[PDB]
Amino acid sequence: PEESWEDDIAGQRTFPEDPNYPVMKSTFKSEYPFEKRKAESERIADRFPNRIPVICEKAEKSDIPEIDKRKYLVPADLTVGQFVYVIRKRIMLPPEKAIFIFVNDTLPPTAALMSAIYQEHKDKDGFLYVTYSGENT
Amino acid sequence: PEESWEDDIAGRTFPEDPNYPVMKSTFKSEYPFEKRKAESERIADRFPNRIPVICEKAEKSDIPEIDKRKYLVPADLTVGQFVYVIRKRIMLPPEKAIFIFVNDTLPPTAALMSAIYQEHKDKDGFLYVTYSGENT
Amino acid sequence: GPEESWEDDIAGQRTFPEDPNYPVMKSTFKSEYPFEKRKAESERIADRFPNRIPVICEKAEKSDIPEIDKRKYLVPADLTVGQFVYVIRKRIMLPPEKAIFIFVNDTLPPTAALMSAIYQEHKDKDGFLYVTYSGENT
Amino acid sequence: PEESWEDDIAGQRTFPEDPNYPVMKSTFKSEYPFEKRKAESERIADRFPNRIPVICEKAEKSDIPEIDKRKYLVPADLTVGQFVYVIRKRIMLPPEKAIFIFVNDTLPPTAALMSAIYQEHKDKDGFLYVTYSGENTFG
Amino acid sequence: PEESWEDDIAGQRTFPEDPNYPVMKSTFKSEYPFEKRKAESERIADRFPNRIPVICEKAEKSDIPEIDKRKYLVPADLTVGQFVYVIRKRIMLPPEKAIFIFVNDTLPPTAALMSAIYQEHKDKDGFLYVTYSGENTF
Amino acid sequence: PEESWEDDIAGQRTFPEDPNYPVMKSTFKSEYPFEKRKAESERIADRFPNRIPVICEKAEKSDIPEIDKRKYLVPADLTVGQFVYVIRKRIMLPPEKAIFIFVNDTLPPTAALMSAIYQEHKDKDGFLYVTYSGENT
Amino acid sequence: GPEESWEDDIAGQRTFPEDPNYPVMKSTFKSEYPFEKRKAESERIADRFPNRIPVICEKAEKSDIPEIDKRKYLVPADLTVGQFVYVIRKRIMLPPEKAIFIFVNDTLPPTAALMSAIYQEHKDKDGFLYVTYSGENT
């Protein structure tokens, strides 16, 4: 025959997390040496003008959802608030939950342009590093 | 497998996040007078020949923000030059007008920032400047 | 959280361009106010401040000398031209190595002329003494 | 807003002279060749019959106030003293300060008529040159 | 620009005399000691043999105009009247107003020669002192 | 600073008479009544006994110089000629010009004594009136 | 104008020269008047003064005795020569210490002679008696 679809994953209305699923996420900087990161940023900047290459990773201690995407090609004219919404849609965080982002331990203002934040805060490797979190540090 | 760069964000008009909570308060409201006067005193002692400007956006204006509001302006700079410093900091395109206000007046372009400071400095030693995309 | 620190990050700049789109317009004093208002004003101020010459001091249009937002000067009658000139200098923060010139009726008043005497001969029909300053004699 | 009047200069501890306001003082004679000057004095004689045309300039070394007027059309019937008072009014020299005038380096008597002083002391170019000072700069 | 001539003194309400204009000249005899005066007159006689050396000053109480010349080298053949006209022309006294002169408080006749007046009235110091006035006081 | 002597009058092309110098040009007799004149001559007779009191005035039609002295106290022994020289010197008439004197409209001889002239011609008031002139009437 | 004062300023002086140009015609009576006029005059006198001798009395030319302007003398007929001589002496004011002489036709008339008798003998054809006076006897 053929298997039928059944809505049977009711759970005990708390769904426990698997006790032994060992996925070992690392920081972007730790996975790639500096020279590789700089070559990549130069290549992306050349290939995508008017785009800010953002490495966006989750704060270590925050239970805000993760996602497998950390590379964001942000149009230079986007505001901080707009980029934050891009992240929200990507991780599918419901609007009632706050989201915060950090560039070097500071909360960028909503109406600042990503290009300006980049101009001030880009890494020596050419990327803009952004941490996102569900709680203010 | 490494993650690929994708030009997938350019996709209409871009809505603002509904719950991204930054303080967004005025400098004077965040710090008491005595702390502010102490700061301006120290900066005057630390950076001679510099005008310490607290530069903030007018609340009702949709001109971009930036995270810098403390500006150490060389005393010989003109108003117009300082305005350009603000523009480049917030990256306002040149086709868009920018205005600044000291005591609710548009200071002249060719005035020296040192003279504007001498006339308009706050009781706490700072020069408070508001920037805007409009002049209402 | 962390307070913004002061950075001396503007002085090191290679250049300092003037802003290309800061649309402030400086009007002539006479052009902003009708005659009868200005005459009423000069009378009112003269009455309120005896022993004072009320001067409207504005920058010559073609001069790149610094401007300033003060143009109403309540000058002691006993001051000389030179002393008043120094008052203007200090107000606009023009460094002393830079020459400064002023004009009443498009003529350069001599130092040690008294402002009271300059006023006696050159006061406007509206009661103010109009003085133009410039960094380049014209 | 509109700019308000403030009496903010009267309370100054001092009032220095400007260190770089360069006025180029030139004697009237040095500014014009003899031809222009004689032509002018003649024109004035024809146009202003009962008037003595006086070029009145400050003695260089004197601390008396200056003024930008140096051409004085003095009615001929005026005495020296009356003309001197005209100078005082024009430069606003306070009465407690003496003032001196000189024609050909001499102090004319107060009751001489300007017409007579002109008759004897007029320049070859038709003008009467008188220098004023706050002291006797020829004694 | 260039200063223009203005007939701006003639319209004045009044014409007061200056309140602090100094008189550096008293009577000729009192300003110089006798020996200097006699030496001077001798010098003039040597240099000018056909000249009467006159010290001519205004009477004290007279409002007739003054003049700065008090030394007159009068030709000996001049009449009193001719010398009187010389004084009138020097001080610019209009002909409609009378002029009088005095030697030793007396009016010399209009047709006496100045040499004769000198011969009788010369001072001990060699000069002839003449007082002029607009009225007959003595 | 002292006024210098300048020969600035002799140069002149002409020398006009003053148009308004009003000095009385009148005769001694018209200025004083007979009583005052006789009183004066009597006082003089007492005060100067050996002196002849002469009132010497110019003929009015004559252009000869005047002088302010008209009272002459003449030594009794002087001749007419000597007295004439006294008049000439007082008025400074140059010798090349003739001089005449008249007593009662007659030319007295140069060698008569003034005392004799007085004896014959004295006025009723006690004076001797003498007219001098540059012309002979 | 104060009254001229009397001054004894002539007698003082050291010399008293005669005027160098006082030209009075010295002329004898006969030379000035023709015989007809003289005779006519003497006849008029003879009718008008019948008891008077008409004498023309003039000074001798070379004599330094004083002159006088009277030369016509109407002499009382009873006068002696000497009395008439005294009349001459007093008219010319010759002091008595000095001698006086008179001449009729170059001869000295006696003192006690009557003038009428001298006239009878010496009268001119023109009717006058001519007498010359002098300080010497020629």
Residue numbers in the entry:
A (entry chain D), F (entry chain A): -22 to 114
B (entry chain E): -22 to -12, -10 to 114
C (entry chain G), G (entry chain F): -23 to 114
D (entry chain C): -22 to 116
E (entry chain B): -22 to 115
Study authors write:
Because a complex formed by ScAtg8 and ScHfl1(368-389) did not crystallize, we resorted to a fusion between them for crystallization, a strategy widely utilized for crystallization of a complex between an Atg8-family protein and a canonical AIM. The crystal structure of ScHfl1(368-389)-ScAtg8 fusion protein was determined at 2.45 Å resolution. The asymmetric unit of the crystal contains seven copies of the fusion protein, all of which form an intermolecular ScAtg8-ScHfl1(368-389) complex in a head-to-tail manner. Among the seven copies of ScHfl1(368-389), two have a slightly different conformation from the others due to crystal packing, while the other five copies have almost the same conformation; therefore, we use one representative structure of the ScAtg8-ScHfl1(368-389) complex from the five copies hereafter. ScHfl1(368-389) has an elongated conformation with a short helical conformation at the residues 374–377, and forms extensive interactions with the W-site, the L-site, α3, as well as β3 of ScAtg8, burying ~2400 Å2 of surface area (detailed interactions are summarized in Figure 3—figure supplement 3A). As is the case with SpHfl1, ScHfl1 neither forms an intermolecular β-sheet with Atg8 β2 (bottom), nor uses a canonical AIM sequence for binding to the W-site and the L-site. Instead, ScHfl1(368-389) uses Trp371 at the coil and Ile375 at the short helix for binding to the W-site and the L-site, respectively, with three residues between them. Unexpectedly, Tyr387 of ScHfl1 binds to a hydrophobic pocket formed between α3 and β3 of ScAtg8. This pocket, which has never been reported to be a binding site for AIMs, is named ‘Y-site’ because it accommodates a conserved Tyr residue in Hfl1. In addition to the hydrophobic interactions, electrostatic interactions are formed between the side-chains of Asp373, Asp374, and Asp384 of ScHfl1 and Arg28, Arg67, and Arg65 of ScAtg8, respectively, and as many as 12 hydrogen bonds are formed between ScHfl1 and ScAtg8 using both the main-chain and side-chain atoms.
